[PDB]
Design a protein around this ligand. Structure first.
Ligand code: PRO
Ligand code: PRO
Ligand code: PRO
Ligand code: PRO
Ligand code: PRO
Ligand code: PRO
Ligand code: PRO
Ligand code: PRO
Ligand code: PRO
Ligand code: PRO
Lengths: 274, 277, 275, 272, 267
């Protein structure tokens, strides 16, 4: 199997870092192309052993699975450039937020019939092999292509198939999720610093607390409210802190965030289709 | 130290999580663990019973059984325990208090009445030790030999992060990583509600939000970059993420988490001043 | 067994009505006294068959179990009024919010030693036999007294023993709780009316919704968050309504309420201990 | 002799099947449930015949509950519309879905379908549901009476005009979730003031149940019952004040309104 | 004079109770009809709307606003020259009513009014507008009949939706305020029964003061508040919550909804 990346941004580096750390891909079996060959991420890939080239056509010719790791508004221009170079062996995997399978297939179909397209939403934690990935299969993605992509993406985190009409909501939850967590961890650390902890120790403790709680939930058959109840001793410090969260509408803010991200994702695609 | 006996006074959530973590790490055999509780009809008690942990209603037997003795009872019960088993403390014992707010000097004062130089360690840990990803800090008491702290850190590092701190930091650690898991559980419930509002099935929404949090936290622990920089790397210009971050800022999301750490730390200090009275 | 009520107000009527509906006591075996024999509760008690008298001493002499259903600050004047009339057979059951076992025992002990005192916190839904009652036992309240107490009060709702130091918080939750629900049901009916429902129907539907939800939780081994998860279909009407509750800090308001009730209960006793 | 079927085996189908069996109005073997992916070990232990095929449930049943997500109703109706017989009563439990849209789809197969629309809720599982129904064009006077007797066995039930069901959805349909949220928060409050969690949850739920039963059995306004519990200067009126200061009442009006408005939106999307 | 009511809800009961208490009409000269079947007063009843029409000279339409067009088409052919039709329905225009009734007989005599429930204690607040064929004697007879149970004055029809938001919905604003003022009295230690009576008397007394005064309500507010005193402290916490803006919001919200409802009726 030969994997290629169109784009050499953060997600291209993240996935190639995870894939090779997982030992599922030899770094030299991965080719990446960038329009800005002086990127910080392009220099990192060259050290890993990832083959590099400025021409997207080189990436198409050298790969079987083809990740589109470009900005959403760049997808149509990439598809126009490489469309005549797609062969029957290709699986085209768009990672762009919002961009639909139908729009990709329509562009590629003008060149050759029956493009094999898969759409996915992943996130940056694939770089430490703890990503969250969903994918949906296009019209001509044979039953094997989805299972192949799930095997590949499972090596860097959780991965499952969804209906495509859920991917915008997933984007608002696990696609944007890490940024919510980085904000929360920065603020939790400021809280620790306010109460007298050194900054380095506060970041470590807050981050370990979030990782541990999330692992607990994933490994538990209990509701998050039940796990919350087990932390909060009657009259104790935790339930006092939980109350001030509630007084600020903490829960509503995170609902607001998933909603706003999902709505914007739909808007960006409506702008694309217009 | 695979011949050491560990005892828990208290058989609640913290005793169970530490006992599960320790045996899951395979650093202690479950039958080498004894726990004592005044209420035996607790769910955690039946759990400990099935693990193979020895259960007893008498704190004295836990003391005679143990080398390391965790005090995993509610903070205001600690002085009652110290009076009960203080005459049973022997030279071999290391007493590890897990009670929020209770000071090393308050423990050493009660125990020194019975026999001098009690070996006392105060720690603050959290429930994720049950999946070996806890966050533990400890402070060493007056007669806690350098070897006792090193033993303590070796033991608690088997179930997550562990480091020594000065004792005057522990109340603030309590508000951050002690209470921290409940902030995350609340956030994960809410994020899952957000996914459900936007059309996702609950089970999938819970899993995605939890995986997102775990992945982000691991990224930061493995990164040499500021969390603000990692946040910047996620936010595409004009995109969905920066739109979501704006609505969090408009609600004072950052300030609420600062409020929580402060409120928990302050309450922890209050609990000790009520005991001190 | 003969039961007495010092005070003939809402709580005495509620308990007496539930007891006689449960069939654990005949109405003629209940005596109630009140400093004001013109209340609507007194007229309802008379029609029920309850004996009514203006003299608290008559109630003490009639009864085996003696409930103190007066306002909290009236208790010290009651205990001084009838302390010398307390006999060995009496179990004194204080229903007054805040008033501690120690304060009652201290005033009664000046007359005869070893008064049998129970402190309880109940609520008005005992009148339909669905109350929430907790009780704590005094120093001389033998094991049979609490067991008898729990048997009597279990006939009109949930009843369990607690440590006394929990009762002020219970007062904030189940003691004041019915008022929180009456407010909620008034508001839910207003929302139904805003959206086009007749008032009478909106009140019936909202009350039925709250009753069934509460019974579901009581009969389930599942967390209330899981039950909430079960009713909220993805993208649906319920999760949209829950969002607007969260945006107003709905959860925090109810936490505020239990806290404020409990704190006030503590303040009231501190003022009494000062007097 | 009446046979009941369920197209969908979700929360609502399980809840109605559980309440109906607890009520003894239906033997569990007279109940069939169908789902694309299945609660399977639950209903089989309960005695409910299960099957993956919707046509089997139609062929087995006299009364046919449609307990699928609202946007799945058109695909169900087109799948089994040709299997509907004269004996069938079709009871839609989907939120927002109109009688006229069900009758329109079914009338393409056979004239005069007997359609009833209802809005019920999950406490039917403990036989304390709140149910309203509206009768369709060809639902004879007998069908609404039969539906009301069946659903009255698992809680409150009454006929309404169909134009009220979206509002009912926002009140008693979504209501239980408002209650579970409140009970979780009331228990947090008890825990903050020192109660064990288990006991706090029990006391809060009992208080809610008792208050609701009081109102249902009382000839008085809920504000009068609220007055009767708040003694002057006491703990309750202090607690009521902090609820008023947060706009507690307005939040519950907001919820009923938001649920009703969404229910209308869900149908306007299906009609489009 | 013969007075009839179509609809038998709160408004019909309020007006009938006020009219008889005022002594302008004997109860037996009044007839009310309703589909959902006052009798103790002596007011004749019937389920048929045509009977009320054939009995009455003045015909009050106290039905819900969305039922008015159904009533007009039901009784339109029985409207006769002697009839004055008085619509109490919120929002419903004189022109919509006259258009309905003119398809049966020309020049219907139509009056539109906005009253409120305190007519039952003869302290209502009523405004009315006269239709195209309401001879000037019909407005005078209307103001005469309605002044016996409260304030009554003629207005241009385009003000009635605003009036509805002020004095039509206003009693509900007051009942909410009186319930809350009572909760305040109870919080501060008063018995509930006494707190209700004191708050209501305070509100009644201040309203009457303003009505019998030539002074601005701010001037009367100044006369109550002594410097540094309890009242001015209380007014501050009202201002801090934006109390004034809430009542403006209420009048506006009610007026706007009244217009929405009529716009839905027109379409
Ligand atoms: O997700 C989608 O839309 C397509 C349809 C069936 C499988 N994948
Ligand atoms: O709630 C409390 O008081 C303890 C301290 C941190 C975890 N739980
Ligand atoms: O932090 C404390 O209190 C002691 C002093 C040095 C080590 N541990
Ligand atoms: O911000 C955006 O548009 C994408 C969505 C998840 C991460 N970046
Ligand atoms: O709770 C109390 O005050 C006492 C102590 C043991 C039984 N009742
Ligand atoms: O959320 C919804 O759309 C439906 C309405 C009541 C229960 N669930
Ligand atoms: O409620 C409805 O819309 C129809 C009309 C009469 C009976 N059911
Ligand atoms: O209002 C009070 O003070 C008492 C305590 C709970 C019920 N009523
Ligand atoms: O107020 C109106 O609309 C009409 C015009 C003059 C008299 N009545
Ligand atoms: O302002 C004051 O202090 C007095 C009290 C009632 C009226 N004015």
């Amino acid at each position: 199997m030969s994997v290629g990346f169109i784009g050499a941004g953060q997600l291209a580096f993240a996935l190639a870092k995870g894939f090779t750390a997982a030992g599922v891909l030899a770094a030299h079996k991965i080719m990446a192309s960038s329009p800005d060959m002086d990127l910080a991420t392009v220099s990192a890939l060259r050290k890993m052993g990832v083959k590099l080239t400025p021409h997207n056509k080189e990436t198409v010719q050298h790969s079987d699975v083809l990740f589109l790791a470009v900005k959403p508004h760049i997808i149509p221009f990439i598809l126009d450039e490489i469309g005549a170079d797609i062969e029957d062996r290709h699986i085209v995997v768009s990672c762009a937020a919002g961009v639909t399978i139908s729009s990709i297939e329509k562009k590629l179909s003008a060149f050759r019939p029956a493009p094999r397209v898969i759409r996915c939403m992943t996130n940056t934690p694939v770089v430490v092999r703890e990503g969250a990935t969903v994918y949906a299969t296009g019209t001509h993605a044979q039953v094997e292509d989805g299972r192949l992509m799930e095997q590949l993406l499972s090596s860097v985190g959780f991965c499952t198939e969804v209906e495509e009409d859920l991917i915008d909501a997933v984007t608002g939850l696990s696609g944007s999720g890490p940024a919510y967590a980085f904000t929360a961890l920065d603020a939790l650390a400021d809280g620790g610093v306010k109460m007298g902890l050194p900054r380095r120790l506060a970041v470590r403790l807050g981050a370990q607390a979030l990782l541990g709680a999330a692992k607990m939930l994933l490994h538990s058959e209990q509701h998050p409210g039940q796990l919350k109840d087990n932390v909060s001793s009657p009259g104790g410090a935790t339930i006092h802190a939980l109350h001030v969260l509630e007084s600020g509408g903490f829960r509503s803010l995170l609902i607001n965030a998933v909603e706003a991200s999902c709505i914007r994702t739909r808007e960006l695609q409506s702008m694309a289709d217009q």
